Design a binder for this molecule. Structure first.
Ligand SMILES: CN(C)c1ncnc2nc[nH]c12
Ligand SMILES: CN(C)c1ncnc2nc[nH]c12
Lengths: 204, 204
């Protein structure tokens, strides 16, 4: 059971821009994902001040980076607040327009995060993104897209607790972001101080 | 009718740090306020995608900077989502601790915003802050504090629509942030691209 949806026309345009605009500084994507993760963690955090039961599906608030050279994927995991099916379809489906009206006036792509639309920076480095997610008031869901104007949503076995898993299947010329000294350099450089623990998994 | 509350002990410590730590680069405060404002606007924005009635108390989404040399105040106004009485008391009343554990390891104060606690940067420049606020599901409220460990909350006449007014009564040696070329320099330098219109009021 698999639903296919059209990206809203402007998200398709924004995404097109990110895939086709020549831009060497692709690395800013990680910061944009870690950044989203942090916001998600701030969210389950603020909520659980007035209502602790919410951390019944995970007490620990943190971020994992999981490289896998065999699949050629980099997974950014958090145990933040998660997405309901509706959010998956909206949130990931007007900060874009500003962004272009900014891209007109001497902004560049590295400012993408300043416009609510950092997620889509994943497309600098990834041929296909899959987003597994579990919000406290819904079941677990899988979202996916290799761009080209559509996405899919299906319910996910293999239950995570509350949280989000952003899986990057990397473009073949972007496997440097699977290397450990590459990831550490990027985290130190762009996300050095951030209110949650970040674990970089090792391989095997 | 005026309630006085104690800041949670760590907020009092964080605030103390900001008032007594020698740090010349005080200007980063504006970016931290404009930044909060923007988040508030993102919030009423996301909400109103699924439920337009919410913008019944204000269709227009924007930020005003209102300098007044007679009162010696700089007001940062937004028509974002607002705060309920509860949020006033919490939200403005653990990103702090991280921040210190970061301040230990070579971070400085300019990173305050990376830790959820940018609001308190107002204290670099302001002897007293007043925050007038109106959330869709509550009446209008005034919050206040000259630090020293407490704040007040009272209901506010003079109704704003939905939104937040952060009033800075500036320290007497900080009146440069009332000058127009000073504000423009700071907005251009630190908040140049941001998803909402910013109006700098002129004086008279
Ligand atoms: C909408 N958006 C980017 C997100 N919302 C909630 N949790 C997340 N974890 C990573 N990205 C997330
Ligand atoms: C908690 N916090 C800083 C705020 N929440 C909502 N609206 C705001 N406008 C300025 N600051 C705001």
């Amino acid at each position: 059971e698999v639903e296919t949806f059209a990206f809203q026309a402007e998200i398709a345009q924004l995404m097109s821009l990110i895939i086709n605009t020549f831009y060497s500084n692709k690395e800013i994507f990680l910061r944009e994902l870690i950044s989203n993760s942090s916001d998600a963690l701030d969210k389950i955090r603020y909520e659980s001040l007035t209502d602790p039961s919410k951390l019944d599906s995970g007490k620990e608030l943190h971020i994992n980076l999981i490289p896998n050279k065999q699949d050629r994927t980099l997974t950014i995991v958090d145990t933040g607040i998660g997405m309901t099916k509706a959010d998956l379809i909206n949130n990931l489906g007007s900060g874009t327009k500003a962004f272009m009206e900014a891209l007109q006036a001497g902004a560049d792509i590295s400012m993408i995060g300043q416009f609510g639309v950092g997620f889509y920076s994943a497309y600098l480095v990834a041929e296909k993104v899959t987003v597994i997610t579990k919000h406290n008031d819904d079941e677990q869901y899988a979202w996916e897209s290799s761009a080209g104007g559509s996405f899919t949503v299906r319910t996910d076995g293999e239950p995570m607790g509350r949280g989000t898993k952003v899986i990057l299947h990397l473009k073949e010329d972007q496997t440097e972001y699977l290397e450990e000294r590459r990831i550490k350099e990027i985290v130190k450089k762009h996300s050095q101080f951030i209110g949650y623990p970040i674990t970089l998994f090792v391989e095997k």
